Amino acid sequence: MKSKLPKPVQDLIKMIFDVESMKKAMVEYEIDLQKMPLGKLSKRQIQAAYSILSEVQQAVSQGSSDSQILDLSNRFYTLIPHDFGMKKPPLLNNADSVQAKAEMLDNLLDIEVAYSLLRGGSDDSSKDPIDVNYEKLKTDIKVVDRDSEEAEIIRKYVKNTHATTHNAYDLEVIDIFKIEREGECQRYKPFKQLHNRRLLWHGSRTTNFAGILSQGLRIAPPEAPVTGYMFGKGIYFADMVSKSANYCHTSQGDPIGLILLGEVALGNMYELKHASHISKLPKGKHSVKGLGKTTPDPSANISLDGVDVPLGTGISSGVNDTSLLYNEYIVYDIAQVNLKYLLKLKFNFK
Ligand SMILES: NC(=O)c1cccc2cn(-c3ccc([C@@H]4CCCNC4)cc3)nc12
């Protein structure tokens, strides 16, 4: 049979299950595709690589000998083979090196999820492969009509919350998808009664979306290094589309990105101006709000189905004694997020 899914949904499935994009991402990370093909990637190996990186992070802060750091570096490259070619393997002896490798592992974890979903399941012929891969996402995906009131609100949110400092590109909404992850409604239900529910942005690389749709937004595993997380291991969101759009890591070569709109149950926010490098919340607080110098104009805030949409144009906040240019929101429980929309964006670079 032929797929009855709308063309934009079919194009989304092709985009998130693109094997060539998975291979190109591994080539960019300088992974040796002969020693470590896409089909050889495993959960166990990525888990053990995170543990090695945490040992490196501990050794660097402890002030361990260069011989122990070299041994941990060598063990990491043995577990994740790299092909540097003309270069000596960079030593993992600083915070920047461990963070670049932890970023690679986060992306490899979701690439492994996408490839294992794609290669799994009943390899029959009765159903269209696009329908088969659609079902592997365990997510209901519907197209939001361009002429709808919903689409108008979302386009206004994209237009008004583009930061002045992120002038490398213009954003254009291609498609708006309404999404419903299986079991997420039931999971979110206890938090639906928490106050201060906001519709916020979450950007990520396109190669992570098969993992995000099938498993939802997740928190970094305990084995992962604690470094590089301004407010600890949690799920981070922005109220400025361009702050999250930067995490799509789109380029002139591939200017099509995916961004989420999630309803997040913030409750009582723990308002911070500087890095806390801690995941523990004070009693009675349900989230962290990192305070930026620029905030969406609160007078243009709208309430949609009991959820605040801060689609106001970026104005000065009043805080100048902060390390953040824009706000960010962090929750430490995966159940405090209900994914609502998925946008396909065109990045028009200057
Ligand atoms: N992804 C986002 O849309 C987003 C919005 C606002 C603030 C954000 C902060 N992040 C974020 C992204 C990545 C990380 C680390 C850094 C590299 C190692 N593992 C993850 C920490 C924070 N992402 C944000």
Rounded to 5 degrees, what angle do the CA atoms 155, 160, 165 make? 125
Q: What is the spatial order of strands in the sheet that 337-349 belongs to?
A: 139-143, 169-181, 337-349, 256-265, 197-204, 307-309, 302-304
- Beta-bridged to residue 175, according to DSSP, are 344
* Contact status, residue 340 vs residue 217, Cβ threshold 8 Å: no
* Contact status, residue 42 vs residue 112, Cβ threshold 8 Å: yes
Q: What residue numbers does the annotated binding site for NAD(+) cover?
A: 202-204, 211, 218, 244
| Alpha carbon distance 10, 258 (integer Å) | 15
By DSSP bridging, strand 337-349 and strand 169-181 are antiparallel
Which fold is adopted by the domain 1-137?
Poly(ADP-ribose) Polymerase; domain 1 (1.20.142)
Q: Which of 240, 247, 323 to mutate to test the pocket of ligand 1 (most atoms within 8 A of CB)?
A: 247
Q: For the chain, what are the domain ranges?
A: 1-137, 138-350
Q: Which residue has a Cα nearest atom 24 of ligand 1?
A: 236
By DSSP bridging, strand 287-290 and strand 269-272 are parallel
| Alpha carbon distance 149, 67 (integer Å) | 62
281: left (phi over 0), alpha (psi -120 to 50) or beta: beta
Does 211 sit in the ligand 1 pocket, CB within 6 Å? no
| Alpha carbon distance 275, 271 (integer Å) | 11
| Alpha carbon distance 314, 312 (integer Å) | 6
Tokens of 313: 């144009």
Half-sphere CA count of 182, side-chain side, radius 13 A:
8
- Burial-class residue 8 by CB neighbours within 10 Å (0-12, 13-18, 19+): middle
Looking at the CA of residue 202, tell me the nearest atom of ligand 1. Answer: 3
Q: Select from 270, 223, 285 the least CA-distant residue to 79.
A: 223
Half-sphere CA count of 87, side-chain side, radius 13 A:
7
| Alpha carbon distance 206, 208 (integer Å) | 5
Q: Select from 119, 182, 120, 136 the least CA-distant residue to 13.
A: 136
| Alpha carbon distance 97, 75 (integer Å) | 15
Q: What is the DSSP track for 48-60?
A: HHHHHHHHHHHHH
Output the CA torsion 346→210→215→162 (10° steps). Answer: -10
| Alpha carbon distance 15, 21 (integer Å) | 9
- Beta-bridged to residue 287, according to DSSP, are 269
Run of H or E residues at 9: helix 7-16
Coil/strand/helix, residue 289? strand
Distance of CA 222 to the CA centre of its chain: 18
Tokens of 185: 């409604």
> Which residues in 108-129 are b (16+ Cβ under 10 Å) and which e?
bbbbbbbbbbbeeeeeeeeeee
* Contact status, residue 267 vs residue 284, Cβ threshold 8 Å: no
Neighbours of 270 (CB within 10 A): 18
**Method used to determine the 3D structure:** X-ray
Tokens of 202: 């979450």
- DSSP designation for 271: E
Coil/strand/helix, residue 242? helix
Neighbours of 259 (CB within 10 A): 22
261: left (phi over 0), alpha (psi -120 to 50) or beta: beta
Coil/strand/helix, residue 153? helix
Run of H or E residues at 136: helix 129-136
- Burial-class residue 230 by CB neighbours within 10 Å (0-12, 13-18, 19+): middle
Does 93 sit in the ligand 1 pocket, CB within 6 Å? no
* Contact status, residue 141 vs residue 177, Cβ threshold 8 Å: yes
CATH top-level class of 138-350: alpha beta
Distance of CA 7 to the CA centre of its chain: 25
Tokens of 158: 């994209």
User: After which residues does the chain become discontinuous at a C–N distance over 2.5 Å?
Assistant: none
Rounded to 5 degrees, what angle do the CA atoms 115, 121, 127 make? 110
* Contact status, residue 231 vs residue 280, Cβ threshold 8 Å: no
* Contact status, residue 40 vs residue 17, Cβ threshold 8 Å: no
Residue 133 Cα to ligand 1 middle (Å): 28
Looking at the CA of residue 244, tell me the nearest atom of ligand 1. Answer: 3
Whole-angstrom distance between the N-terminal and C-terminal Cα of the chain? 44
Neighbours of 68 (CB within 10 A): 13
- DSSP designation for 155: H
Q: What is the DSSP track for 56-113?
A: HHHHHHHT--HHHHHHHHHHHHHHS-B--TTSPPPP--SHHHHHHHHHHHHHHHHHHH
* Contact status, residue 139 vs residue 217, Cβ threshold 8 Å: no
Output the CA torsion 67→71→73→78 (10° steps). Answer: 160
Report, in angstroms and rounded to the nearest whole number, the Rg of the chain calculated over CA atoms.
21
Same fold, 1-137 and 138-350: no
